[PDB]
Amino acid sequence: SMALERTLSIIKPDAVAKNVIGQIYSRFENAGLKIVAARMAHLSRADAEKFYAVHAERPFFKDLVEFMISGPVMIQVLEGEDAILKNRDLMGATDPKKAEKGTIRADFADSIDANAVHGSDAPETARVEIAFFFPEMNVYSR
Ligand SMILES: Nc1ncnc2c1ncn2[C@@H]1O[C@H](COP(=O)(O)OP(=O)(O)O)[C@@H](O)[C@H]1O
Fold this sequence. Notes:
There is one protein chain. By secondary structure, the protein is of the alpha+beta class. The protein has one domain: Nucleoside diphosphate kinase-like domain (Alpha-Beta Plaits). It has helices at residues 13-17, 21-30, 45-51, 61-68, 83-91, 104-108, 123-133, and strands at 4-11, 34-41, 73-81, 117-119. It is globular. Residues 55, 60, 63-64, 94, 112-113, 115, 118, 121 line the site of adenosine-5'-diphosphate. Its EC number is 2.7.4.6.
């Protein structure tokens, strides 16, 4: 057995607009991950900037923020064995052109400029990202 983990997932505005929330949810659920918190939201500039602070110096920072506030997102906490890595494996590489066939990014995105999904990349970032978007009373382990 591996540790039971929680990770923060975002279906970005591109995939929400494509109306493929359900298909992406089924990738998680069929992989053995459970949706334990969820909310559709529309991020403010400030919140997007805070959430992606780690990339504040990167050349893509401005574009990322404008993209993430361009329309509603679907945010969820995924729980299961090895959830953090499992989610990342389902998402695929940052660049959809380089992502493996069958990943969410390969299947639902075309360029790095709009790449469908976010997932926490480590235990530490998972904790911070979950607490950013959900109070613990609105996360329901099962
Ligand atoms: N060169 C780029 N141009 C536009 N957006 C980018 C670029 N690189 C990264 N991004 C955006 O910033 C997000 C976070 O970057 P990063 O954490 O490095 O990738 P990942 O989301 O695969 O963990 C990416 O998922 C993507 O939406």
